Ligand binder design. Structure first.
Ligand SMILES: [Zn+2]
Ligand SMILES: [Zn+2]
Lengths: 114, 195, 37, 49, 177, 49, 144, 130
C-alpha cells in the first residue's frame, strides 16, 4: 500500500470516507487538506511473506573477498562466467538454503536464483 | 587527520546533502560518529588501505571495516581495540619476499626492524571487526597454491598459527595432540611451577 | 529347455501405466546428463 | 488493550536523566523537525520500500 | 564393475547401461542380490532412493523373478529402523508399497495381496494398508477375476475412509458375488 | 544538547547531526524488525574495548 | 596385595606403540573420512539446488543438520569400529579398557582414528563471525 | 493425525497468507475483479446486507496447504467467526473450489467503522481458535 504526504504541511494523509458521496479521500489532519484517493486499499499486510531477496541483494557484494566464486553459472545479461554465490541467511528465511548468484563482472550486477 | 583527509576526497558531509542521496551512497562513520556519505566506497577503501600501509596520514592501529551489504564504512581510531599483525596477500601471492627475510636475518648492524616491515606495507595490524571482512590464509605454502579452487581471493595470511596461544599455553609441547581441558589445566599449573 | 512360456494371467486392464515408467524416464534423463559431463 | 495491538507495534526512546520513555517522533519534534516527511527522511532513506 | 566400484555416486550415470544389462535375466538377479545386501545393511537410508527403482526394472522385465523381489520387499517392510524418524519410516514403507504396487501391475497380484491381508489381520498401521489399496484402485480397470476379488475385497471392509472405491464396490458386488 | 548522543556533539548546531544519527538508530531497529539485519551479539569481541 | 605383587612380574605400561594402528587401518579410516566428506558435499549441493525436501516436522535447516549429523556420526562409529578391530591382544590401551579400569572404546577411537565432531550447546560450531565459524573459510560453508 | 489436528492450537494467523482492507463503496460490486465473480453469486440473496452495509471490506487470503493439513473447510471458519462476533459482522466466503481462498468481512447494516476493522484483524489473527 502507498504512502501519501500533505502538500501543505507534509504530514501523513489518513484515509477518510464521505458518506455524502461514498468515496475514499486521503485527508490531512491538523491542516484540513484533502486529496481524492485512488488505490481503494487502505491497508494490506502479508503473513506468509513471499518476499524476494533478489530485490534486497546489492550488486556490490560481487566485491566481497570472503564470498565464494563459481564458474559453473555464467551470467545472463553479459555471459560472464565468474559469479559470486551466497545464501539469504536472514529472518523470513531458514526454510530454504537456496543460492543467489551475482555476476562478478563490473557494470553488470545481474543477480538471479536457480 | 582522518576527517581532514576524508573532506579532501569526495565525501559529502551530512549537513551539505539532501536526504535523497543517502539511499544509494555508503555511510561513513568515524569512531562511531556518522560524519558523512560517499558514492564510491571501493576506491575509498583502496585509498585508505594504501595510506595505512604506507604509514601516511592513517596510523597503523586505525581499523577500517566496509560492511558491503549494509553500505557502511566504519573507521575506528579509539583505544582499547585488540588487533594482531597479518601478512598481506595480493593476487594469491605474499608481499613478503626473500629480500625482507635477508634484511631481517642481519637485523643487528642494519637497523631493519619490524617497524620497517610495517612501513614496507607487507604486514598490517587487523582487528576482529576488520577480521569480519578478511579472507585469511592459514599458511602460504598450501592455502594459496593452485588447486581445485576453494578460495582464490585471500587478502591476508597467518604468520604462524601457533601464535593464537598465550604465554602459559605456549610452553606446552604438542598441545594439538591433547584433550583441550588438559591444555587449560597445564596453563593453570605452569604459573604454579618452581623455577 | 522348457519350451515356450505362458504369458502372465491378466487380471485387469492398465488404464494408465504406473509411475515407475515416469521414474524410468527421469532417471534416464539424468543418465544422459551425466553422460554429457 | 485491543487498540494498541490494532495500530501495531510502536517505537519509544528511553533517554538519559528521564525516568520515563518517550515516543520517537516527539524526540524528532524536540530537535526542530515538525514535518513528518522530514522526520521520515531522517529515518527512512528510500521511500520506495 | 559398478557393484564393486562403491565410490557408487556414478550410479545415476550408469543407469541406462544398467537397464540394458539388466535385460539379461542373470544380470538382473545379480543386481537383485547386490541390492539385497546393500539395502539390508543398517543405516543405508541417508538419501532423498535409486536401488529400489532398480527393482522396478527387475520386475518389469522378468516375471520369473517376481517371487524374489517380493520376498526382499516384505523383509524390508518388516525390518525396524531406529535412526529413522517415525514419519520417515512411514514414508519409507510407503515407498516399499509403491514397489509392491509396481510388482502387482505385472500380474503377480495374488501373493502380494495375500501378504497384505495377512499383515493386516495378523500389526502394521492401517494407514499403510489404506494407502496401498488407494494406489491399487488408482490404476486397475475392469473387468477382474474371481480370485482377485476373493483376496482384494475381504480386506476392503475394515476401513470406511476413502471415486474408484465406490465404483469398484458397484462393479464387484454385482459381477463378483 | 548534552545528555542525548554527546559523541555526535554538544554544540547548538549539531541538532541536525544528532537528528540524522537518531534516525539511523531507528533505521537499524527497523531493519532488525524486518529481519534484514542480524541482531548484534553481546559476546562478539569486536564489540569489546 | 597378591595381585600388586604379581604385577611386579607381569608389569603394566602404556606407550606410543599402543596408539599406533596398522597402515591398512589408517588407509581404511582415511577412505571412510573421504567418503563421509563427499556425502556431506552431496547433501550440501542438493540443499543448495533446492533438491533437498524437508522431513515432516522439520524445517529444511533442521533436515539438513540432522542429515549431516547422522552422516558424520556414521563415519565416527565406522572409524572407531575399524580402529578397535586393528588392536592387538597385547595393546595396553585395550588391556585397560577391557578390564574397565580406565577409559572406554570412544577414547581409543579418538586417540587412534578420529576425534570427531565438536559440539557447543549440542549443535555444530556456530557462525560467530559474519556467516563464518572463522575467517579462514568462505561465507556460507557448511562443510564438516 | 486427525486426532493431532484436534489438539494443536490453530489460530487464524496459522492459515492466512495475507490480509487486506479495502473501501469498496458499492457492496454490489468489488474493487477486485476476481472477487466479483463469486461476490455477485453471494449478492443474489443478500443477508444482513439487503440495505447499505458498511463501505469497508476486509478481504483475507487463506493458504491452501495449511487449510488442508488441518483438515478445515471454509464453512467452519465462517461459522467460527459468526459465533465469536455474533451478528455484528457479516462474513462472506468464496466457495472452496477456487485457488484464492477468500473471506470478505463487513460490519452489519444496523451499526469508527474503519479502525475497528484493523482491531478486528488483530483480534482474529491472535485470539480466535479455529
Ligand atoms: Zn496538512
Ligand atoms: Zn553479468
Amino acid at each position: 500500500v502507498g504512502i501519501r504526504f500533505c502538500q501543505e504541511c507534509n504530514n501523513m494523509l489518513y484515509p477518510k470516507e464521505d458518506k455524502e458521496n461514498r468515496i475514499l479521500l486521503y485527508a490531512c489532519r491538523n491542516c484540513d487538506y484533502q486529496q481524492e484517493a485512488d488505490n481503494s486499499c487502505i491497508y494490506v499486510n502479508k503473513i506468509t511473506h513471499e518476499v524476494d531477496e533478489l530485490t534486497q541483494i546489492i550488486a556490490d557484494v560481487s566485491q566481497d573477498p570472503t564470498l565464494p566464486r563459481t564458474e559453473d553459472h555464467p551470467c545472463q545479461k553479459c555471459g560472464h562466467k565468474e559469479a559470486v554465490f551466497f545464501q539469504s541467511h536472514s529472518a523470513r528465511a531458514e526454510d530454504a538454503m537456496r543460492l543467489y548468484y551475482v555476476c562478478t563482472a563490473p557494470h553488470c550486477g545481474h543477480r538471479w536464483t536457480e | 587527520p582522518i576527517l581532514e583527509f576524508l573532506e579532501e576526497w569526495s565525501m559529502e558531509n551530512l549537513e551539505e546533502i539532501s536526504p535523497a542521496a543517502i539511499a544509494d551512497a555508503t555511510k561513513i562513520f568515524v569512531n562511531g560518529c556518522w560524519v558523512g556519505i560517499h558514492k564510491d566506497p571501493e576506491q575509498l577503501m583502496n585509498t585508505l588501505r594504501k595510506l595505512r600501509r604506507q604509514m601516511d596520514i592513517i596510523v597503523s592501529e586505525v581499523s577500517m571495516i566496509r560492511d558491503i551489504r549494509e553500505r557502511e564504512i566504519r573507521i575506528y581510531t579509539d583505544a582499547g581495540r585488540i588487533c594482531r599483525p597479518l601478512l598481506i596477500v595480493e593476487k594469491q601471492k605474499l608481499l613478503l619476499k626473500k629480500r625482507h627475510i635477508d634484511q631481517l636475518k642481519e637485523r643487528e648492524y642494519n637497523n631493519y626492524s619490524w617497524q620497517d616491515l610495517v612501513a614496507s606495507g607487507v604486514v598490517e595490524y587487523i582487528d576482529t571487526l576488520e577480521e569480519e571482512t578478511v579472507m585469511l590464509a592459514m599458511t602460504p605454502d598450501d592455502l594459496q597454491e593452485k588447486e581445485v579452487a576453494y578460495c582464490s581471493t585471500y587478502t591476508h595470511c597467518e604468520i604462524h598459527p601457533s601464535m593464537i596461544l598465550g604465554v602459559c599455553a605456549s610452553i606446552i609441547p604438542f598441545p594439538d595432540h591433547n584433550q583441550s581441558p588438559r591444555n587449560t589445566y597445564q596453563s593453570a599449573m605452569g604459573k604454579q611451577a618452581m623455577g | 529347455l522348457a519350451g515356450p512360456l505362458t504369458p502372465p494371467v491378466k487380471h485387469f486392464q492398465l488404464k494408465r501405466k504406473p509411475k515407475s515408467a515416469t521414474l524410468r524416464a527421469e532417471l534416464l534423463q539424468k543418465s544422459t546428463e551425466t553422460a554429457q559431463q | 488493550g485491543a487498540k494498541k495491538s490494532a495500530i501495531g507495534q510502536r517505537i519509544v526512546a528511553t533517554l538519559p536523566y528521564i525516568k520515563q520513555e518517550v515516543p520517537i517522533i516527539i524526540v524528532f519534534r524536540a530537535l526542530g523537525f515538525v514535518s513528518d516527511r522530514d522526520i521520515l527522511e531522517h529515518i527512512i532513506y528510500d521511500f520506495e520500500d | 564393475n559398478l557393484c564393486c566400484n562403491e565410490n557408487a555416486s556414478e550410479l545415476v550415470a550408469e543407469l541406462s547401461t544398467l537397464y540394458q544389462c539388466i535385460r539379461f535375466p542373470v544380470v538382473a538377479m545379480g543386481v537383485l542380490k547386490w541390492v539385497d545386501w546393500t539395502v539390508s545393511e543398517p543405516r543405508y537410508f541417508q538419501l532423498q532412493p535409486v536401488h529400489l527403482a532398480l527393482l522396478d526394472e527387475i520386475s518389469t522385465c522378468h516375471q520369473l523373478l517376481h517371487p524374489q523381489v517380493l520376498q526382499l520387499l516384505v523383509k524390508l517392510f518388516e525390518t525396524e529402523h531406529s535412526q529413522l524418524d517415525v514419519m520417515e519410516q512411514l514414508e519409507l514403507k510407503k515407498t516399499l508399497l509403491d514397489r509392491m504396487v509396481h510388482l502387482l501391475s505385472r500380474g503377480y497380484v495374488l501373493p502380494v495381496v495375500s501378504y497384505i491381508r495377512k499383515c493386516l489381520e495378523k500389526d502394521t498401521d492401517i494407514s499403510l494398508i489404506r494407502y496401498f489399496v488407494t494406489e491399487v484402485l488408482d490404476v486397475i480397470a475392469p473387468p477382474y477375476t474371481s480370485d482377485f476379488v476373493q483376496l482384494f475385497l475381504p480386506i476392503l471392509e475394515n476401513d470406511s475412509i476413502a471415486d474408484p472405491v465406490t465404483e469398484f464396490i458397484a462393479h464387484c458386488k454385482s459381477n463378483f458375488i | 544538547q548534552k545528555e542525548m548522543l554527546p559523541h555526535v556533539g554538544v554544540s547548538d548546531f549539531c541538532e541536525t547531526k544528532k537528528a540524522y544519527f537518531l534516525g539511523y538508530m531507528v533505521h537499524r531497529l527497523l531493519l532488525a524488525a524486518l529481519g534484514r539485519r542480524e541482531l548484534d551479539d553481546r559476546d562478539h569481541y569486536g564489540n569489546k574495548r | 596385595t597378591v595381585i600388586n605383587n604379581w604385577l611386579l612380574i607381569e608389569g603394566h605400561t602404556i606407550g606410543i606403540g599402543d596408539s599406533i594402528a596398522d597402515s591398512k587401518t589408517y588407509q581404511d579410516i582415511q577412505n571412510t573420512i573421504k567418503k563421509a566428506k563427499q556425502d556431506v558435499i552431496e547433501v550440501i549441493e542438493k540443499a543448495h539446488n533446492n533438491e533437498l525436501e524437508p522431513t515432516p516436522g522439520n524445517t529444511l535447516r533442521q533436515t539438513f543438520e540432522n542429515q549431516v549429523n547422522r552422516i558424520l556420526n556414521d563415519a565416527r562409529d565406522k572409524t572407531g569400529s575399524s580402529a578397535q578391530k586393528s588392536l592387538s591382544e597385547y595393546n595396553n590401551f585395550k588391556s585397560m579398557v577391557v578390564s574397565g579400569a580406565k577409559g572406554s572404546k570412544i577414547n581409543i577411537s579418538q586417540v587412534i582414528a578420529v576425534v570427531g565432531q565438536q559440539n557447543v550447546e549440542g549443535k555444530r560450531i556456530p557462525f560467530g563471525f559474519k556467516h563464518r565459524t572463522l575467517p579462514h573459510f568462505i561465507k556460507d560453508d557448511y562443510g564438516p | 493425525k486427525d486426532i493431532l489436528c484436534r489438539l494443536e492450537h490453530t489460530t487464524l494467523r496459522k492459515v492466512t497468507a495475507n490480509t487486506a482492507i479495502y473501501y469498496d463503496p458499492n457492496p454490489q460490486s468489488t474493487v477486485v475483479a476476481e472477487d466479483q465473480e463469486w461476490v455477485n453469486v453471494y449478492y443474489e440473496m443478500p443477508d444482513f446486507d439487503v440495505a447499505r452495509i458498511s463501505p469497508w471490506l476486509l478481504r483475507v487470503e487463506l493458504d491452501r496447504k495449511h487449510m488442508t493439513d488441518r483438515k478445515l473447510t471454509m464453512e467452519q471458519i465462517a461459522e467460527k467467526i459468526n459465533a465469536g462476533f455474533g451478528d455484528d459482522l457479516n462474513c462472506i466466503f468464496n466457495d472452496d473450489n477456487a485457488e484464492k481462498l477468500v473471506l470478505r468481512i463487513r460490519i452489519m447494516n444496523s451499526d469508527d467503522d474503519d479502525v475497528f476493522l484493523r482491531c478486528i484483524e488483530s483480534n482474529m489473527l491472535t485470539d480466535m481458535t479455529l
